[PDB]
Structure 1
Amino acid sequence: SKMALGIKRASRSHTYHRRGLWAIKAKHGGALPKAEKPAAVAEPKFYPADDVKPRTVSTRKPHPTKLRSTITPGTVLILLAGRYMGKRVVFLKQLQSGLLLITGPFKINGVPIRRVNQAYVIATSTKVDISKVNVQKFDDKYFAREKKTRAKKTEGELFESDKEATKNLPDFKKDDQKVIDAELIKAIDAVPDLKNYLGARFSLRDGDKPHEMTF
């Protein structure tokens, strides 16, 4: 219904409703409000020679990426790129930036609760029942890096010293993975053989055609 949606959105009356010009006929009496003259700073510190153009605070409000039809909270994905390729994970929930949020769990797979792009995953037809996992604590800030300054060039005394020390991933993430993998193993033992499944990794051995291979 892409084009029916196009017309239904495109109606002048429906655009009145959508922009909500009522409740703009509410506040300023029985009429549409005036607008005024901002920008009375009158204090330019320096005058560029080129014709000046201000910063773009972008007013375009892009649509959200559409999560694939074959993705359900609880679906066993297939990672495809990066250090966890072949790893089979379980999809927790497609988070607010658009990226998928998956888990090993780390007790069996070594794949922590981590962010994965939707492009690099192949949803399998199997599901798990996980409506009693409490995932609300995960978001973009949990994962946002605050990547540090490039003044630290990794030298012969940094190489294994970072391995040998622990100034790394924090202990609240340590405890996090414990709570999620507990409440998710309690959901995996239900599905027979699934722990062994997830323990395996998908390998496209000889005589395997992906166009033929279902998932």
Structure 2
Amino acid sequence: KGKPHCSRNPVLVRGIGRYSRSAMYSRKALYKRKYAALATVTKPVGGGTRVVKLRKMPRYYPTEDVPRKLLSHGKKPFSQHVRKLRASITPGTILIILTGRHRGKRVVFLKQLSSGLLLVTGPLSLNRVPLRRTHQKFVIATSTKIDISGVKIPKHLTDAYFKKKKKYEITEQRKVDQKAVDSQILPKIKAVPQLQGYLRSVFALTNGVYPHKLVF
């Protein structure tokens, strides 16, 4: 019993607390918190009753087996890895896809997903790309942004939604979600002059220009 209180010290730096041992002994008020000192089931049968033993022994042991592994601590499954995002990437930023089938297409970025992939879309009405996922490494984040803080995207879309199944047919749910997102995205980009044509165009490298020199 007892409601779980939050930690009494803000994290000063990772692994170091703001308050020392005595300050903690005071804040926790420990000066007044002193304390001092299955495998069988009976069943009826039509005889009598039988004590059936669940978890019965195997009917085959292999010729030989591998031993156990030593224990390690710092290794966690991909589900609960901490997700990182580049500073230059914020909702409403223009990205340049570098490796997909949509090579060098300028695309608006909306949301960071749960597994770290970026939920991205440039309204397919003009640059022909749907709601999609893209790894944050394989995109160039240019320094041009629109304001999409006042748009709502459905909460039902997620990595489970975008996960591949199994010919691929687009679903009516996909169509309606794309329409719902673009109906709010498009007027925002149409406010900025010469932005729809910019998104329609495709990025490329000509001779005499070098990425380390040019800024974006």
Structure 1 and Structure 2 fold alike (TM over 0.5): yes
> What does residue 47 of structure 1 align with?
61
Distance 1:7 1:145, change over 3 A: closer
1:188 and 2:196 matched: no
Deviates more, 1:42-51 or 1:93-102: 42-51
1:91 and 2:109 matched: yes
Distance 1:132 1:7, change over 3 A: closer
1:139 and 2:122 matched: no
2:129 to 101, 105, 111: 111
Secondary structure of residue in 2 paired with 1:142: helix
Asked whether the equivalents of residues 128 and 187 of structure 1 are also in contact (C-alpha less than 8 Å), the reply is yes
Asked whether the equivalents of residues 132 and 183 of structure 1 are also in contact (C-alpha less than 8 Å), the reply is no
- Map 1:58-97 onto structure 2 (within 5 A): 60=76, 63-97=81-115
How many residue pairs get aligned? The number is 174
Distance 1:51 1:197, change over 3 A: closer
Which residue identity lines up with residue 145 of structure 1 in the other structure? K
Higher relative contact order (CA 8 A, sep 6+): 1
Cα distance between partner residues in 1 of 2:184 and 2:117: 23
Gaps of 5+ in 2: 1-11, 25-32, 37-52
* Deviation (angstroms), 1:106: 0.9
Cα distance between partner residues in 1 of 2:187 and 2:171: 25
Secondary structure of residue in 1 paired with 2:199: helix
* Deviation (angstroms), 1:97: 0.4
Q: Tell me the TM-score normalized by structure 2.
A: 0.69
Gaps of 5+ in 1: 17-25, 32-39, 149-161
- Runs of 4+ with >6 A deviation: none
Distance 1:103 1:139, change over 3 A: same
Which residue identity lines up with residue 90 of structure 2 in the other structure? T
RMSD: 3.4
> What does residue 121 of structure 1 align with?
139
> What does residue 16 of structure 2 align with?
8
1:205 and 2:213 matched: no
CA deviations over 1:48-89 (Å, ceiling 9, x no partner): 3315659x9x97265423100100000000110121011000
